[PDB]
């Protein structure tokens, strides 16, 4: 089936045919001495006349009752070519390099606060063009954390989308180093965005700040009237810092993972099997933020193949399936949250269509085909899931919907994106690994069917450490230079590993049994009644609780007691299918009707649960539930 789809595609679909990578360009990009900016330059020249990037079309609607004008999204995308994108980059790079008073120099830090967009890419590529160090701030971060990062990095420039200007201005009023505030993704005919921009300008002026607040459009206009900027190419023996990717773990404090010029280059053309992908057509919907490695690889990896990178219209996945259905990408990268959304759409549709006359011999297949064709676009050739665990049942469901394999990719900000693919160690980039016993969590080389322990890694893609964090950096490498992943794995055989959970997520119950709470959250995602779930336990208790956000369908026509009974029954079925032990099953739960979001601090920018924030939010209620059940 797949092979026939591909043949039809490459015979009838002119968009796909025109986007086929050029072997000659990929060869040039691969050349041994190519540095980061040269890769960018070579790609843009090589694919000049092709569509490179796309964003939702929009119009400006004026409500005559409020008199207010608002940007409204239209059901189509518009593109710009490689030539056009590189022209924009060149204008920015010229504006920054040839500035009469205070030009930017290689090694200077530039902070960017946004999502992922044509403008974001423009700014990011301009940093690369000049050898500036990009600091892609996590939009999920609290202002105090943003200020701490700015203090650490002392950037000379801050760029922000209008949605984040309130945060940007607070950062600048706190006396941080940026000399200019560049507003991008900016539509001045939208009254809300114009208000945000004018407020920023007014507030900084009122404070007596010397910061210059300007639009990206104005920066480009200035650059248009200047000579071309030099392309930064480091000494053959040098590998300067190019990028910091901030990441947070046990202690919620963000650390800046150091990406050198060479490490950042792997995001364009990697060396692994999946980041190699050299001849696959790359028509992509980018919905992960540029503040995450996955978002960067999604953009740069597609540009390196002369494909077309389409940007999702919103950062909270609220337009995701509209966007994917319009773009009809040839490849899709899933995070488990998105798989959940596909499953939840499937369940809603199946339930709705399961009427008296329905042929249940066939309805399941129809609903999945609807998802495959109309929600996922029907043109994808490959699919990958990563960033968090996907449970076996959900993986089987997804493969049934996709009608092709869902590759599981394991990696990290520290170690590299390509560590495991379908449980196989990837060489390159991996050089060596070992498992280390974790006695306190009951994981040993001598275990049940398979050795278990913490994964320690050597790889070409490991970071040198975290920016200005000497002690933390010392603690993440062992005495033989292995990076300590903090992740528990099971070793099926040499180079074949199964991810278990993060060490941090392993909980010992009062009876002595260990539970892996993120793994379990993934298992229960398969309940048709659960929209989201957070599992919580206490080492002083013998059983687990959960905070459950029910689906809208689950809530309909039920009171709390009946809803809890329904959820308990579904959890029981899921647990039996997944062969769980009794202690791995949540026994009681908090019903939460407000979903976890980026905005309320409970999801990350890639839609992973923020466990420290969930515990802060629900911990007191959950502990009270333990006592109330006790009494």
Ligand X SMILES: Nc1ncnc2c1ncn2[C@@H]1O[C@H](COP(=O)(O)O)[C@@H](O)[C@H]1O
Token readout for 66 is: 């409020």
| 487 labeled part of a ligand binding site | yes
Q: Which stretch binds ligand X (CB under 6 A): 387-395, 473-481, 532-540, 591-599?
A: 387-395
Say how many CA atoms lie within 13 Å of 374 toward its Cβ. Answer: 8
Q: State yes or no: residue 330 binds ligand X (CB under 6 A).
A: no
Q: C-beta of 84: minimal distance to ligand X in Å?
A: 32
| 608 labeled part of a ligand binding site | yes
Q: Which stretch binds ligand X (CB under 6 A): 143-151, 397-405, 409-417, 545-553?
A: 409-417
Query: Residue 294 in contact with residue 333, Cβ under 8 Å?
Result: yes
| 5 labeled part of a ligand binding site | no
Nearest alpha carbon to residue 115 among 151, 160, 68: 160
Residues 472-491 that bind ligand X (CB under 6 A): 485, 487
Q: Which stretch binds ligand X (CB under 6 A): 198-206, 228-236, 275-283, 403-411?
A: 403-411
Site string for ligand X, 27-66 (x = CB under 6 A): ----------------------------------------
CA distances from 34 to 18, 120, 261, 462, 550 (A): 26, 24, 10, 20, 51
Q: C-beta of 429: minimal distance to ligand X in Å?
A: 15
Q: State yes or no: residue 386 binds ligand X (CB under 6 A).
A: yes
Q: State yes or no: residue 136 binds ligand X (CB under 6 A).
A: no
Specify the pairing of strand 283-286 against strand 308-311: parallel
Q: State yes or no: residue 466 binds ligand X (CB under 6 A).
A: no
| 500 labeled part of a ligand binding site | yes
Nearest alpha carbon to residue 594 among 605, 606, 582, 602: 602
| 292 labeled part of a ligand binding site | yes
Question: DSSP of 501-548, one letter per residue?
Answer: EEGGGEEE-TTS-EEEHHHHHHHHTT-TTEEEEEEE--TTSSS-EEEE
Q: State yes or no: residue 395 binds ligand X (CB under 6 A).
A: no
Specify the pairing of strand 241-247 against strand 255-260: antiparallel
Residues 189-248 that bind ligand X (CB under 6 A): 247
Contacts of 238 (CB under 8 A, 6+ apart): 261
For CA atoms 455, 458, 461, 465, the dihedral sign is: positive
Q: Which stretch binds ligand X (CB under 6 A): 107-115, 380-388, 527-535, 569-577?
A: 380-388
Q: State yes or no: residue 388 binds ligand X (CB under 6 A).
A: yes
CA–CA distance, 30 with 503 (Å, rounded to integer)? 38
Query: Residue 17 in contact with residue 301, Cβ under 8 Å?
Result: no
| 413 labeled part of a ligand binding site | yes
| 153 labeled part of a ligand binding site | no
CA–CA distance, 465 with 320 (Å, rounded to integer)? 34
| 387 labeled part of a ligand binding site | yes
Choice from 42, 138, 266, 412 touching ligand X (CB under 6 A): 412
Choice from 255, 328, 502, 611 touching ligand X (CB under 6 A): 502
Q: State yes or no: residue 454 binds ligand X (CB under 6 A).
A: no
Q: State yes or no: residue 408 binds ligand X (CB under 6 A).
A: yes
3-state secondary structure of 230: coil
DSSP at 162: G
Binding-site annotation: residue ranges? 292, 387, 408-409, 413, 487, 499-502, 508, 608
Binding-site annotation: residue ranges for AMP? 292, 387, 408-409, 413, 487, 499-502, 508, 608
Q: Which residues bind ligand X (CB under 6 A)?
A: 247, 293, 386-389, 408-413, 485, 487, 499, 502
């Amino acid at each position: 089936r797949l092979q026939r789809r591909i043949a039809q595609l490459f015979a009838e679909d002119e968009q796909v045919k025109a986007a086929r990578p050029l072997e000659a360009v990929s060869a040039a990009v691969s050349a041994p001495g190519m540095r980061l900016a040269q890769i960018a330059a070579t790609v843009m020249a090589g694919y000049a006349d092709r569509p490179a990037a796309g964003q939702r079309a929009f119009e400006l609607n004026t409500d005559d009752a409020t008199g207010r004008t608002s940007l409204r999204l239209l059901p189509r995308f518009e593109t710009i070519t490689y030539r056009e994108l590189w022209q924009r980059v060149g204008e920015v790079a010229a504006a920054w390099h040839h500035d009469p008073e205070n030009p930017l120099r290689a090694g200077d830090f530039v902070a960017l606060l946004g999502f992922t967009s044509i403008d974001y890419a423009t700014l990011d590529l301009a940093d690369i063009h000049l050898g500036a160090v990009t600091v892609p701030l996590q939009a999920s971060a609290a202002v105090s954390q943003l200020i701490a990062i700015l203090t650490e990095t002392s950037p000379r420039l801050l760029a922000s989308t209008p949605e984040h200007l309130d945060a940007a201005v607070e950062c600048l009023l706190a006396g941080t180093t940026p000399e200019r505030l560049v507003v991008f993704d900016y539509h001045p005919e939208d009254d809300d965005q114009r208000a945000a921009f004018e407020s920023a300008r007014r507030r900084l002026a009122d404070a007596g700040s010397l910061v210059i607040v300007e639009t990206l459009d104005a920066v480009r206009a200035r650059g248009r009237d200047l000579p071309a900027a030099p392309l930064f190419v480091p000494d053959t023996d040098d590998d300067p810092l190019a990028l910091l990717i901030y990441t947070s773990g046990s202690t919620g404090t963000p650390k800046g993972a150091m990406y050198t010029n060479r490490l950042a280059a792997t995001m364009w053309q990697g060396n692994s099997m999946l980041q190699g992908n050299s001849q696959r057509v790359g028509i992509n919907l980018n919905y992960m933020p540029m503040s995450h490695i996955a978002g960067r690889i999604s953009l740069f990896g597609v540009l390196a193949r002369g494909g077309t990178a389409y940007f999702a219209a919103k950062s909270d996945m609220s337009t995701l399936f509209e966007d994917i259905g319009l773009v009809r990408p040839t490849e899709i990268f899933f995070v488990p949250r998105v798989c959940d959304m596909v499953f939840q759409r499937y369940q809603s549709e199946l339930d709705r269509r399961s009427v008296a006359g329905a042929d249940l011999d066939t309805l399941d297949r129809e609903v999945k085909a609807d998802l495959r064709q109309n929600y996922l676009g029907g043109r994808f050739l490959v699919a990958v899931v990563g960033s968090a665990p996907l449970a076996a049942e959900m993986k089987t469901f997804m493969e049934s919907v996709l009608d092709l394999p869902l590759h599981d990719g394991y990696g990290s900000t520290e170690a590299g994106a390509s560590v495991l693919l379908d449980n196989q160690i990837q060489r390159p980039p991996v050089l060596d690994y070992k498992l280390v016993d974790v006695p306190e969590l009951g994981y040993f080389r001598t275990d049940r069917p398979h050795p278990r322990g913490e994964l320690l890694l050597k790889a070409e893609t490991t970071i040198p450490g975290y920016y200005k964090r000497p002690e933390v950096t010392a603690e993440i490498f062992d005495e033989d230079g292995f990076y300590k992943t903090g992740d528990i794995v099971a070793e099926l055989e040499h180079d074949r590993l199964v991810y278990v959970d993060r060490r941090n997520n392993v909980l010992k119950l009062s009876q002595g049994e260990f539970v892996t709470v993120a793994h379990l959250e993934a298992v229960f995602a398969s309940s048709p009644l659960i929209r989201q779930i957070f599992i919580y336990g206490s080492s002083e208790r013998s059983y687990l609780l959960a905070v459950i956000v029910p689906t809208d369908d689950a809530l309909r026509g039920r009171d709390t007691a009946t809803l809890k009974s329904a959820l308990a029954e579904s959890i029981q079925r899921i647990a039996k299918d997944a062969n769980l032990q009794p202690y791995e099953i949540p026994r009681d739960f908090l019903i939460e009707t407000e979903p976890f979001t980026i905005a309320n601090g409970l999801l990350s920018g890639i839609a992973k649960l923020l466990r420290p924030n969930l515990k802060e939010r629900y911990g007191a209620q959950l502990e009270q539930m333990y006592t109330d059940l006790a009494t």
